[PDB]
Enzyme design. Structure first.
Site, PDB file in Angstrom:
ATOM      1  N   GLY A 152      21.054  -3.508  49.785  1.00 18.54           N
ATOM      2  CA  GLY A 152      20.539  -4.541  48.902  1.00 18.54           C
ATOM      3  C   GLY A 152      19.512  -5.411  49.603  1.00 18.54           C
ATOM      4  N   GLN A 175      14.736 -13.154  51.562  1.00 19.21           N
ATOM      5  CA  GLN A 175      14.764 -12.452  52.842  1.00 19.21           C
ATOM      6  C   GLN A 175      13.383 -11.946  53.261  1.00 19.21           C
ATOM      7  OE1 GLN A 175      18.252  -9.880  51.652  1.00 19.21           O
ATOM      8  NE2 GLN A 175      18.679 -10.083  53.850  1.00 19.21           N
ATOM      9  N   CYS A 223      24.470  -8.159  57.243  1.00 21.75           N
ATOM     10  CA  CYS A 223      23.266  -8.601  56.532  1.00 21.75           C
ATOM     11  C   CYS A 223      22.055  -8.218  57.372  1.00 21.75           C
ATOM     12  CB  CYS A 223      23.332 -10.119  56.284  1.00 21.75           C
ATOM     13  SG  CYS A 223      21.877 -10.917  55.542  1.00 21.75           S
ATOM     14  N   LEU A 224      20.984  -7.750  56.734  1.00 12.92           N
ATOM     15  CA  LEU A 224      19.761  -7.409  57.451  1.00 12.92           C
ATOM     16  C   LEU A 224      19.154  -8.645  58.119  1.00 12.92           C
ATOM     17  CD1 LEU A 224      18.206  -4.972  54.807  1.00 12.92           C
ATOM     18  CD2 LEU A 224      19.330  -4.355  56.957  1.00 12.92           C
ATOM     19  N   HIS A 248      27.068 -11.018  47.465  1.00 13.81           N
ATOM     20  CA  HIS A 248      26.317 -11.180  48.709  1.00 13.81           C
ATOM     21  C   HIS A 248      24.816 -11.450  48.436  1.00 13.81           C
ATOM     22  CE1 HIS A 248      25.649 -10.110  53.090  1.00 13.81           C
ATOM     23  NE2 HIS A 248      24.430  -9.993  52.597  1.00 13.81           N
ATOM     24  N   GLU A 249      24.203 -10.641  47.572  1.00 13.77           N
ATOM     25  CA  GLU A 249      22.767 -10.807  47.293  1.00 13.77           C
ATOM     26  C   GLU A 249      22.477 -12.124  46.588  1.00 13.77           C
ATOM     27  OE1 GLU A 249      20.791  -9.126  48.809  1.00 13.77           O
ATOM     28  OE2 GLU A 249      22.110  -7.455  49.327  1.00 13.77           O
ATOM     29  N   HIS A 302      22.242 -15.287  48.681  1.00 17.95           N
ATOM     30  CA  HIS A 302      20.917 -15.561  49.264  1.00 17.95           C
ATOM     31  C   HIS A 302      20.060 -16.482  48.389  1.00 17.95           C
ATOM     32  CE1 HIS A 302      20.738 -13.181  52.853  1.00 17.95           C
ATOM     33  NE2 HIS A 302      21.173 -12.110  52.218  1.00 17.95           N
TER      34      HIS A 302
HETATM   35  C1  LIG Z   1      28.290  -5.405  52.553  1.00 16.35           C
HETATM   36  C2  LIG Z   1      27.789  -6.626  51.838  1.00 16.35           C
HETATM   37  C3  LIG Z   1      26.281  -6.789  51.967  1.00 16.35           C
HETATM   38  C4  LIG Z   1      25.479  -5.640  51.379  1.00 16.35           C
HETATM   39  C5  LIG Z   1      23.966  -5.822  51.500  1.00 16.35           C
HETATM   40  C6  LIG Z   1      23.419  -5.776  52.933  1.00 16.35           C
HETATM   41  C7  LIG Z   1      21.893  -5.911  52.928  1.00 16.35           C
HETATM   42  C8  LIG Z   1      21.426  -7.346  52.837  1.00 16.35           C
HETATM   43  O1  LIG Z   1      21.134  -7.997  53.839  1.00 16.35           O
HETATM   44  N1  LIG Z   1      21.359  -7.824  51.608  1.00 16.35           N
HETATM   45  O2  LIG Z   1      20.894  -9.116  51.399  1.00 16.35           O
HETATM   46  C9  LIG Z   1      23.770  -4.462  53.564  1.00 16.35           C
HETATM   47  O3  LIG Z   1      23.196  -3.418  53.260  1.00 16.35           O
HETATM   48  N2  LIG Z   1      24.743  -4.533  54.481  1.00 16.35           N
HETATM   49  C10 LIG Z   1      25.323  -3.365  55.122  1.00 16.35           C
HETATM   50  C11 LIG Z   1      26.820  -3.646  55.263  1.00 16.35           C
HETATM   51  O4  LIG Z   1      27.211  -4.786  55.433  1.00 16.35           O
HETATM   52  N3  LIG Z   1      27.680  -2.618  55.159  1.00 16.35           N
HETATM   53  C12 LIG Z   1      27.370  -1.214  54.866  1.00 16.35           C
HETATM   54  C13 LIG Z   1      28.587  -0.756  54.108  1.00 16.35           C
HETATM   55  C14 LIG Z   1      29.743  -1.552  54.717  1.00 16.35           C
HETATM   56  C15 LIG Z   1      29.130  -2.835  55.304  1.00 16.35           C
HETATM   57  C16 LIG Z   1      29.513  -3.071  56.759  1.00 16.35           C
HETATM   58  O5  LIG Z   1      30.876  -3.450  56.898  1.00 16.35           O
HETATM   59  C17 LIG Z   1      24.692  -3.089  56.504  1.00 16.35           C
HETATM   60  C18 LIG Z   1      23.219  -2.713  56.395  1.00 16.35           C
HETATM   61  C19 LIG Z   1      24.869  -4.269  57.449  1.00 16.35           C
HETATM   62 FE   LIG Z   2      22.173 -10.296  53.247  1.00 14.30          FE
END
Ligand SMILES: CCCCC[C@H](CC(=O)NO)C(=O)N[C@H](C(=O)N1CCC[C@H]1CO)C(C)C
Ligand SMILES: [Fe+2]
Ligand SMILES: CCCCC[C@H](CC(=O)NO)C(=O)N[C@H](C(=O)N1CCC[C@H]1CO)C(C)C
Ligand SMILES: [Fe+2]
Ligand SMILES: [Mg+2]
Lengths: 161, 159
Positions: free
Chosen positions: B45, B50, B89-90, B131-132, B135
């Site tokens: 997401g 961001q 989070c990215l 989460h999104e 932000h």
């Molecule tokens: C999970 C809740 C957040 C989802 C969105 C985020 C991306 C982001 O920064 N959105 O603003 C993401 O892809 N996060 C992933 C993430 O948190 N994941 C991937 C699936 C499981 C979980 C890690 O426990 C990675 C890239 C860090």
């Molecule tokens: Fe995030």
């Protein structure tokens, strides 16, 4: 030089045991190893749990100036309830900085590696360093102490110069 | 590919403004930039703040989560049930923390053409949406963590 544990390791969350015997070769070795690790990382302090040793031993001291100190089995008593916010980083939390409120003025007590008592009054940065290191001895890293997470982030972002 | 702002940047800490006009070239470009940036970073997401754009636009999609553009969103919990789960989070690279989120939500918003979106989501789908949208009100997930024993570097927590 031992590896410094990073936040997420359960060993950083433990309450450390008091040192029972002073002026022993193993304690001298612990202290030497800690100074080697700290200087190698250019740190202003280090706590034994940060290298995986669950003992109430911290070292600190850097040339404002902080006296070079080995502090064992410490206790901290705030002189007043006055507190001050300041930026902190931690070798166990690389790449980040946070604003942490600490007591402005403290008395602290403990022993050196020979078992000689230490009783000092400290303020400002000196007091901050001692509080930061002793927090490691009760399994606390500074993000546990942050109240304003607007003031938490990557060093490069917070301080781009 | 626009740069993803990292924690510490004040632009991550603001209240986003709603999109006033739909189906515009500038909105289509925003959505394209967000998708390019998100995909480049392998994210599930992304929210407009961001990449430094203070508008109520989020995208997500990775029970597969459907690829979605969600604009001017609102979230209404279906029940007060919550579940703790690991989040990253990215904007907070290298770290993970445990965050409580609503287990079941309805959410409402619009796509980039102004068509309404109305969905019920649970579990991970509900988590990503919360989460999104956080932000958009200046919240990063460490702000939702109460217990920092459950926070640390990804490589250490999950070797
Ligand atoms: C999970 C809740 C957040 C989802 C969105 C985020 C991306 C982001 O920064 N959105 O603003 C993401 O892809 N996060 C992933 C993430 O948190 N994941 C991937 C699936 C499981 C979980 C890690 O426990 C990675 C890239 C860090
Ligand atoms: Fe995030
Ligand atoms: C300031 C309170 C913490 C002092 C001790 C830490 C070292 C550590 O990990 N202690 O266990 C340190 O050297 N931190 C430094 C640090 O925070 N500094 C260096 C002086 C100024 C301040 C950053 O504002 C850097 C290396 C991260
Ligand atoms: Fe530290
Ligand atoms: Mg308007």
């Amino acid at each position: 030089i031992r590896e410094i544990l990073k936040m997420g390791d359960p060993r950083l969350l433990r309450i450390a045991d008091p040192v029972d015997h002073f002026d022993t070769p193993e304690l001298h070795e612990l202290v030497k190893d800690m100074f080697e690790t700290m200087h190698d990382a250019n740190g202003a302090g280090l706590a034994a749990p940060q290298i995986g040793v669950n003992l109430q031993v911290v070292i600190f001291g850097f040339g404002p100036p902080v006296p070079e100190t080995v502090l064992i089995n410490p206790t901290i008593t705030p002189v007043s309830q006055d507190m001050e916010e300041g930026w902190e980083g931690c070798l166990s939390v690389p790449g980040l900085r946070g604003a942490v409120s600490r007591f402005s003025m403290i008395k602290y007590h403990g022993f050196d590696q020979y078992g000689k008592p230490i009783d000092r009054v400290a303020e400002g940065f000196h007091a901050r360093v001692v509080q930061h290191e002793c927090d490691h001895l009760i399994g606390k890293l500074y993000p546990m102490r942050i109240n304003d997470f607007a003031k938490f982030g990557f060093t490069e972002v917070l301080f781009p110069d």
